[PDB]
Design a protein around this motif. Structure first.
Motif, PDB file in Angstrom:
ATOM      1  N   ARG A   3      87.659  -6.662  25.766  1.00 44.47           N
ATOM      2  CA  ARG A   3      86.459  -6.517  24.810  1.00 44.47           C
ATOM      3  C   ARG A   3      85.648  -5.170  25.191  1.00 44.47           C
ATOM      4  O   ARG A   3      85.247  -5.209  26.501  1.00 44.47           O
ATOM      5  N   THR A   4      85.484  -4.381  24.347  1.00 44.14           N
ATOM      6  CA  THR A   4      84.638  -3.104  24.662  1.00 44.14           C
ATOM      7  C   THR A   4      83.296  -3.067  23.858  1.00 44.14           C
ATOM      8  O   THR A   4      82.930  -3.615  23.247  1.00 44.14           O
ATOM      9  N   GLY A  27      81.872  -9.378  30.972  1.00 44.76           N
ATOM     10  CA  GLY A  27      82.157  -9.666  29.589  1.00 44.76           C
ATOM     11  C   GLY A  27      82.633  -8.492  28.835  1.00 44.76           C
ATOM     12  O   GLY A  27      83.034  -8.632  27.608  1.00 44.76           O
ATOM     13  N   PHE A  28      82.168  -7.209  29.252  1.00 44.04           N
ATOM     14  CA  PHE A  28      82.486  -5.992  28.691  1.00 44.04           C
ATOM     15  C   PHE A  28      83.274  -4.790  29.480  1.00 44.04           C
ATOM     16  O   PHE A  28      82.950  -4.873  30.499  1.00 44.04           O
ATOM     17  N   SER A  29      84.143  -4.029  28.748  1.00 44.15           N
ATOM     18  CA  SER A  29      84.610  -2.916  29.365  1.00 44.15           C
ATOM     19  C   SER A  29      83.648  -1.764  28.522  1.00 44.15           C
ATOM     20  O   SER A  29      83.808  -1.957  27.412  1.00 44.15           O
ATOM     21  N   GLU A  36      89.840  -1.119  18.134  1.00 41.26           N
ATOM     22  CA  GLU A  36      90.008  -2.501  17.625  1.00 41.26           C
ATOM     23  C   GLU A  36      89.341  -3.599  18.593  1.00 41.26           C
ATOM     24  O   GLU A  36      89.236  -4.636  18.219  1.00 41.26           O
ATOM     25  N   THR A  37      89.202  -3.267  19.903  1.00 40.66           N
ATOM     26  CA  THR A  37      88.457  -4.202  20.919  1.00 40.66           C
ATOM     27  C   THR A  37      87.044  -4.063  20.917  1.00 40.66           C
ATOM     28  O   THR A  37      86.458  -5.003  21.332  1.00 40.66           O
ATOM     29  N   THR A  38      86.303  -3.129  20.310  1.00 38.39           N
ATOM     30  CA  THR A  38      85.113  -2.812  20.327  1.00 38.39           C
ATOM     31  C   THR A  38      84.055  -4.023  19.481  1.00 38.39           C
ATOM     32  O   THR A  38      84.322  -4.155  18.225  1.00 38.39           O
ATOM     33  N   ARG A  58      83.942  -1.454  11.372  1.00 38.75           N
ATOM     34  CA  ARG A  58      84.507  -2.514  12.044  1.00 38.75           C
ATOM     35  C   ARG A  58      83.887  -3.817  11.926  1.00 38.75           C
ATOM     36  O   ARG A  58      83.908  -4.859  12.576  1.00 38.75           O
ATOM     37  N   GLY A  59      82.441  -3.912  11.390  1.00 42.28           N
ATOM     38  CA  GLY A  59      81.510  -5.064  11.593  1.00 42.28           C
ATOM     39  C   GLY A  59      81.131  -5.223  13.066  1.00 42.28           C
ATOM     40  O   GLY A  59      80.807  -6.048  13.336  1.00 42.28           O
ATOM     41  N   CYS A  60      81.052  -4.189  13.717  1.00 41.98           N
ATOM     42  CA  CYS A  60      80.411  -4.308  15.247  1.00 41.98           C
ATOM     43  C   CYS A  60      79.011  -4.540  14.969  1.00 41.98           C
ATOM     44  O   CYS A  60      78.306  -4.261  13.948  1.00 41.98           O
ATOM     45  N   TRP A  61      78.277  -5.033  15.978  1.00 39.49           N
ATOM     46  CA  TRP A  61      76.790  -4.977  16.365  1.00 39.49           C
ATOM     47  C   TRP A  61      76.437  -3.561  16.724  1.00 39.49           C
ATOM     48  O   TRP A  61      77.038  -2.903  17.534  1.00 39.49           O
TER      49      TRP A  61
END
Length: 188
Positions: A3-4, A27-29, A36-38, A58-61
């Protein structure tokens, strides 16, 4: 972690804090570009970068730096919504909400009723990225101008009366308003 998180419009002294907080909270890189992982995009200033656009698609925060500061203070990653940049980017909570409520893999449907688009190789943002945005938001990209109803970006070739020639800004404004814009003001 796979997860990025992606930083954008972020001055190097705030970037430094984020790297330290991520190192401590896990929890993150941290990645340079939304992919795709963001799941989280952090913006330092309220500017429509390509990473903001991709984060929306992508519907990210899409969050303020303040989420990082409060998370450090409270000892863990905290609720994102109080920090979501909804005033600057109204499309952000809309896509983020659609994405989390999505039963399977998320894909936007903004352009699902639009004809296939030919994207100019001379387009800005770069053609591969502009195509990625169209696809992520539910549209279809045509590999050649022949038979395409919509042509996006600089185009000095032969024009047809039954094709729409629209600036890249038509795609970007549609994405940020979460509504397909009227073509009138984007012609040529």
């Amino acid at each position: 972690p796979t997860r990025t998180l992606v930083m954008t419009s972020m001055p190097s002294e705030k970037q430094n804090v984020v790297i330290q907080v991520v190192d401590k909270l896990k929890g993150f890189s941290i990645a340079p570009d939304v992919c795709e992982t963001t799941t989280h995009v952090l913006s330092g200033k309220p500017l429509r970068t390509l990473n903001v656009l991709l984060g929306i698609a992508r519907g990210c925060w899409v969050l303020s730096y303040d989420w990082v500061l409060w998370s450090l203070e409270l000892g863990h990653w905290i609720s994102e919504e109080p920090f979501e940049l909804s005033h600057h980017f109204p499309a952000a909570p809309l896509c983020r909400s659609e994405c989390h409520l999505s039963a399977g893999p998320y894909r936007g449907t903004l352009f699902a009723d639009q004809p296939a688009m030919f994207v100019s190789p001379a387009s800005s943002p770069p053609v591969a990225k502009l195509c990625e945005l169209v696809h992520l938001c539910g549209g279809r990209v045509s590999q050649v101008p022949r038979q395409a109803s919509i042509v996006i970006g600089p185009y000095s070739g032969k024009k047809k009366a039954t094709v729409k020639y629209l600036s890249e800004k038509w795609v970007l404004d549609s994405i940020t308003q979460h509504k397909v814009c009227a073509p009138e003001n984007y012609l040529l």
